[PDB]
Design a binder for these strands. Structure first.
Lengths: 68, 66
DNA sequence: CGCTAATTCAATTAACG
DNA sequence: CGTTAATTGAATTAGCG
């Protein structure tokens, strides 16, 4: 099935991915405040940061052996 | 420490959201981007509003199925 | 084709008045 | 406490070297 017109796929920079990953290592579920400070520091929207964390947890769960 | 924050919509914001819901239950990105300007909300809050509004609507159909 | 960003859902949690 | 906005995993869609 084909979905309706969607937002253009965001291409992140080397800096952005490295910066987001540092926060992911501290916590997989950052509060709104943590995400907003990452959104300003990386010049991203709080929305793109929240979707990145949603997908980063999905990638981590797939590779993970343990229950958590 | 409040982990998440909450958006309290104005009556005008709700009129403009419900207007687009009655035209299209699944607005495209171009349609959502317009509401973001019209209602001063982010496109992100329009997605979230629309998915709760859809969930809310499907519950009605399940109750009035016979 | 692999990786991953974006968008749906059902179930559930938590902010606000 | 009631209302409902926000968040989550899971599934899925799809852009793009």
């Amino acid at each position: 099935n084909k979905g309706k017109k969607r937002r253009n796929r965001t291409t992140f920079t080397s800096y952005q991915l490295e910066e987001l990953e540092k926060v992911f290592q501290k916590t997989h579920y950052p509060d709104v405040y943590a995400r907003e400070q990452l959104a300003m520091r990386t010049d991203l929207t709080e929305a793109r940061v929240q979707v990145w964390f949603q997908n980063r947890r999905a990638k981590w769960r797939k590779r993970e052996r343990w229950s958590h």
